[PDB]
Amino acid sequence: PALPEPFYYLHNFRAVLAWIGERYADLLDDQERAFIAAFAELPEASQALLVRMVMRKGTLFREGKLAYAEIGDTRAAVQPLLALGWVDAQPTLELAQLFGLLKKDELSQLFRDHLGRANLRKDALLERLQPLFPEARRLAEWQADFAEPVYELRCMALCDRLRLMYFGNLWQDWSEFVLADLGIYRYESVEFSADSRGFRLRADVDAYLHLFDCRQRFDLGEPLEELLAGLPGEPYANPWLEGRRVKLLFQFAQHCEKQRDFDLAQRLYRQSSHPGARLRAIRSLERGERFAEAHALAREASCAPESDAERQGLARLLPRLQGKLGLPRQARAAAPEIDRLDLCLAFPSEPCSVEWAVREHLEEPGCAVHYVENGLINSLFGLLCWEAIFAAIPGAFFHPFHSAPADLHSADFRQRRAALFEACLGRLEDGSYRDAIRCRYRDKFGLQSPFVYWELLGEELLEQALDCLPAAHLRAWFERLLEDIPGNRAGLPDLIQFWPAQRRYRMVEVKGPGDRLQDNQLRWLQFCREREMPVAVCYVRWHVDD
DNA sequence: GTTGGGATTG
DNA sequence: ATTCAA
DNA sequence: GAATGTGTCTCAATCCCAACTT
Ligand SMILES: [Mn+2]
Ligand SMILES: [Mn+2]
């Protein structure tokens, strides 16, 4: 809604350039330093223009779309950049690309002679015409009576490299700068180090691009046979960067299981240390009619499971596999009594989701019901332990746009902060946790964070939950979430009802018609009935009056 | 003349 | 977070 | 009991441009 200087975007970009200049100094190229120096030389209007095309979706641009008052004359402004080889008039265009720049009418005009079928949707015209014109051409070789030049940015790879270096990733755009200055995103500010950085070695960055490239080509239909050749068969020394590879292999293997080539899926899964990969491997060997290997792997697994989620699903596999090897089946006890509560209910209608239905039914005078589904517990954990999460641990923050420390899913995350996590959870054992949370709720409100859900967490909910939830149950929860952060933020029950009168609560997971407990949920209920925490599963039928 | 999607803006 | 198999 | 529709990257106006309506 108007920031005072019309050149705000280029100012932001010059910031990024200088930042890379002083932090990633020792990591740079001849190409890269050449680019930064060259960009400094350029006049203001041409710098600005370059930035406008960098920030925009395409790589090609009709001169008409490049209309800006701060820049003024597009053609006068683009000359320095054409000279530099960073922009390209008369680029050579594939026919899809040409369909991207021109309008439908212009193209019905231009191909009037090779088309008479019918005026139909534009994409279908492209389908009809790519057979005919297989070769690319300059723009004048398509039509030379077209009155508008067209420019191709040819330095987008170097810019992507820079954006990667700044953010440590490739999903955050440059608008992070303007969105945060309008107060739309609002991040927490951390004093990190004067030489904190996302990437220590250059070959790391080289590898993040390589992996990213592999994910992209995969999403456009390329066969694994050459993708797999292109990946490293040997792990990476960087921990976080091996994380990204191992995930990639995982998805390759999911694709593999869809096509029902099970043996390659077993292979790929087995060379991955991803969460719950080993379990997909056993399941694929089973699906591949390979029971001795699968049994073998499952017995290897139940020695030291990666996770609770792995135990839970081993308890299903291992019998099934013993069966399929002709080994006698084995005794067990049943799933501990699901604390079941039924409700016949009026047919909405119109809907009116189930959880709102129950939320209203159980909401009586004297009893407050909230729909939260683990927003409330992750929230109270985020608030208590804020200054732990946002502690300035070396390498963990390195620009002003972090919603979360970069080592949050790291397995040494607890360790590195154990000092401040015992300090913060310790506030539960005194009386001070109530107040500390109400202060942190007031100060940190609206701050992008990984754990707090400010929209959901009103003042009524925070007060009631504060005075109704015992601290021993909270210690029990925050310890569990800390244990396996990405696996245990997941399955907590839909509703929480409080009786503020008696400072007591009960969480209720609502299951509608033909809905059953998912695995994370079942793990959470087990954990709860082991601390004698009030949970209950509510199964809902409907009732139509015939 | 109107609707809906995707890009662009600050 | 929804669908087949018996 | 299993499968298979998501990827976390949750900002609102505004403009352009296909597509539909008689
Ligand atoms: Mn739910
Ligand atoms: Mn539910």
Q: Are residues A417 and A368 in the same domain?
A: yes
A178 touches strand B (CB under 7 A): yes
Handedness of CA A393, A420, A389, A447 (dihedral sign): negative
Residue A64 to residues A101, A147, A171, A448, Cα–Cα distance (Å)? 11, 10, 29, 38
* DSSP letter for each residue of A18-67: HHHHHHSGGG--HHHHHHHHHHHHS-HHHHHHHHHHHTSS-SEEETTT--
Specify the DSSP class assigned to residue A93: B
Q: How far is the CA of A228 from the C1' of D7 (A)?
A: 21
Measure, in angstroms, how far nucleotide D7 C1' is from residue A112 CA: 41
How many Å does it take to go from CA A216 to C1' D19?
31
Strands A368-371 and A340-346: unpaired
Same structural domain for residues A66 and A97?
A: no
Residue A479 CB in 7 A reach of strand C: no
* Backbone Cα Rg of chain A: 29
Within 13 Å of residue A151, how many CA atoms lie on the same side as its CB?
Answer: 24
Is A94 annotated as contributing to ligand binding? no
Q: Residue A411 in contact with residue A273, Cβ under 8 Å?
A: no
Q: Are residues A168 and A61 in the same domain?
A: yes
Residue whose structure tokens are 């641990």: A393
- Please name the nucleotide lying closest to A404, CA to C1': D9
Task: Give the environment of ion ligand 1: residues with CB less than 5 A.
Answer: A 494
**Run of H or E including A11:** helix A8-23
Quickly give A481 CA vs D7 C1' distance in Å. Answer: 24
Tell me: do A318 and A186 sit in the same domain: no
Distance CA A158, CA A54 (A): 11
- Domain edge (last residue) among A128, A143, A158: A143
Helix axes A30-41, A8-23, angle to 10 degrees: 140
In this complex, the nucleotide whose C1' atom is nearest to the CA atom of residue A58 is B7
Asked whether A397 and A198 are in contact (CB, 8 A), the reply is no
- Alpha carbon A151 to its chain centroid, in Å, reads 33
Instruction: Quote the domain boundaries for residue A305.
Output: 200-333
Structural contact between residues A115 and A126, judged by C-beta atoms closer than 8 angstroms: no
Whether residue A92 contacts residue A137, with contact meaning beta carbons closer than 8 Å, is answered with yes
Half-sphere exposure of A303 (CA within 13 A, CB side): 8
Judgement on whether residues A506 and A496 belong to the same structural domain of the protein: yes
Q: Are strands A504-511 and A150-153 parallel, antiparallel or unpaired?
A: unpaired
Count the domains in chain A: 4
- Co-location of A26 and A63 in the same domain: yes
Final residue belonging to a domain, choices A199, A234, A266: A199
Answer for the pair A53, A151: CB distance below 8 angstroms, yes or no. yes
- List, in order, residues 6 or more apart from A526 with CB less than 8 Å away: A336
Name the nt closest to A353 by C-alpha to C1': C1
Task: Please name the residues in contact with A243: beta carbons below 8 A apart, sequence gap of 6 or more.
Answer: A409
Residues A357 and A473 in one domain: yes
The 3-state secondary structure of A105-163 reads: HHHHHHCCCCCCCCCCCHHHHHHHHCCCCCCCECHHHHCCCCCCCEEEECCHHHHHHHH
Asked whether residue A434 falls in the same domain as residue A546, the answer is: yes
Other residues' Cβ atoms within 10 Å of the Cβ of residue A253:
25
What share of residues in chain A are helix, strand, coil (percent, to 5)? 50, 10, 40
What does the DSSP 8-state code read for residue A98? H
Query: Is there a single domain that holds both residue A353 and residue A453?
Result: yes
- Considering the domain architecture, whether residues A186 and A279 belong to the same structural domain is answered as no
DSSP string, A200-232: SSHHHHHHHHHHHHHHHHHHTT--HHHHHHHS-
Between the CA of A523 and the centroid of ligand 1 the distance, in Å, is 15
Q: Pick from A125, A143, A161: which residue ends a domain? A: A143
Q: Give the nucleotide nearest to A100 (CA→C1').
A: D17
**Greatest C-alpha distance within chain A:** 84
Residue A537, annotated as binding a ligand: no
According to DSSP H, which parts of A168-305 are helical? 176-181, 202-219, 224-230, 239-258, 262-270, 277-287, 291-301
A265 plus A279 within the same structural domain: yes
User: Do A119 and A191 have their domain in common?
Assistant: no
Q: In what helix (H) or strand (E) does residue A89 lie, and over which residues does it extend?
A: strand A87-89
The helix/strand/coil state of A95 is helix
Task: Output the distance from A278 CA to B7 C1' rounded to whole Å.
Answer: 43
Note whether A454 and A411 are within 8 A (CB): no
Q: How, if at all, do strands A535-543 and A504-511 pair?
A: parallel
What's the A121 CA to ligand 1 centre distance in angstroms?
A: 41
Do A256 and A265 meet the contact criterion of CB atoms below 8 Å apart? yes
Distance A171 CA to D9 C1' (A): 7
**Ligand 2 mean position, distance from CA A325 (Å):** 37
Strand B contact residues in chain A (352-391), C-beta within 7 Å: none
Q: Phi and psi at residue A51, in whole multiples of 5°?
A: -65, -45
Of A352, A364, A290, nearest to A324 by C-alpha is A290
> Are the CB atoms for A429 and A360 separated by under 8 Å?
no
Contact A302, A268 (CB under 8 A): no
- By CB neighbour count within 10 A (0-12 exposed, 13-18 middle, 19+ buried), where does A445 fall? exposed
Q: Which nucleotide's C1' sits nearest to the alpha carbon of A514?
A: C2
Identify the sign of the CA torsion A206, A209, A211, A213: negative
